[PDB]
Amino acid sequence: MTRIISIVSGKGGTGKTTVTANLSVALGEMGRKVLAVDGDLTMANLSLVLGVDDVNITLHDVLAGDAKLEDAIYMTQFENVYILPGAVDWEHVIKADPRKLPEVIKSLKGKYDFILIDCPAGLQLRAMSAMLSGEEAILVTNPEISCLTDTMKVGMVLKKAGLAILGFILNRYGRSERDIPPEAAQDVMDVPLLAVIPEDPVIREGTLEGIPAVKYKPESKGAQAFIKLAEEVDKLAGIKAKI
Ligand SMILES: Nc1ncnc2c1ncn2[C@@H]1O[C@H](COP(=O)(O)OP(=O)(O)O)[C@@H](O)[C@H]1O
Ligand SMILES: [Mg+2]
């Protein structure tokens, strides 16, 4: 039962790409075959944070009808993690039909244990097309009320569209003393808190190095938090196996 999970939020800069990157790597380490998909058509960032530098053909070419989907799937430096990357040049950006995202992504069912979709924030055409490509969703938020509500709003929309909202992640926690604590955040949100990920410079270093915190610095608290989240998310694979 390949789980297609959209990583979404109400605002930008909340950690959608970071979550997609670390969760993909962690699950890959747990023995799961993972495809991380860059659903952010205008700001393709996934390949960079995953340090994938051998990219030519992209998701954008598939969406433009110019390439086969199987020719846009790359092996990454991370165990059991594959990437369906986005192009960064504007010419590819405009020719990519967003509307074809759900059919492209879903035609991959049966080939991975997880397909994680890094989505752009908001509710415009690009964002909806990406988010609606998944069948489950994880809401990423920061500890500020406006972010929480705007995100729960996105969550309701996806809920009405037929997706199972697994829960939310309280990211960037401990960044400010005005940060809403977990419990209060859990009260505001109507879905389970899946994890509290602290504001952690190690996570930022990972982003910059093209190596997610999880594998970059395995003992850090940033990594440990993402590993715990991966353990949790990984519940529809049963075997909890690599053996
Ligand atoms: N828990 C965290 N600790 C430290 N830095 C973080 C954390 N979460 C996100 N960041 C940073 O904030 C930025 C967020 O970018 P990103 O994850 O791409 O957000 P989005 O995809 O939602 O726009 C990156 O520079 C990343 O290093
Ligand atoms: Mg992003």
Indicate the pairing of strand 3-8 with strand 74-75.
unpaired
HSE of 62, CA atoms in CB hemisphere, 13 A? 24
DSSP 3-state percent helix, strand, coil across the chain (nearest 5): 40, 20, 40
Q: Are 99 and 129 contacting, i.e. CB atoms less than 8 angstroms apart?
A: yes
Q: Kindly tell me the number of DSSP H helices and DSSP E strands found in the chain.
A: 11, 8
Q: Which residues pair with 143 in a beta bridge?
A: none
Backbone angles phi, psi at 142, to 5 degrees: -110, 160
Resolution (A): 2.3
Cα–Cα distance, 15 to 9 (Å, whole number): 9
Which residues line the pocket of ligand 1, CB cutoff 6 A?
9, 12-18, 45, 171-172, 197-200, 203-204, 207
**Residues with beta carbon < 5 A to ion ligand 2?**
16-17, 45
End-to-end CA distance of the chain: 18
Q: Specify the 3-state DSSP secondary structure of 27.
A: helix
- Which CATH number does the domain housing residue 81 bear? 3.40.50.300
Question: Which method was used?
Answer: X-ray
Q: Are 49 and 86 in contact (CB under 8 A)?
A: no
- The minimum-distance atom of ligand 1 relative to the CA of 18 is 17
Alpha helices (H) along the chain = 16-29, 46-49, 59-63, 90-95, 101-106, 125-131, 145-160, 182-188, 201-209, 213-216, 221-233
Starting at the edge strand that comes first in sequence, how are the strands of the sheet with 81-84 ordered? 74-75, 81-84, 34-38, 114-118, 3-8, 136-141, 164-173, 193-198
Structural domain harbouring 163: 2-243
How far apart are the C-alpha atoms of 142 and 116, rounded to whole Å? 20
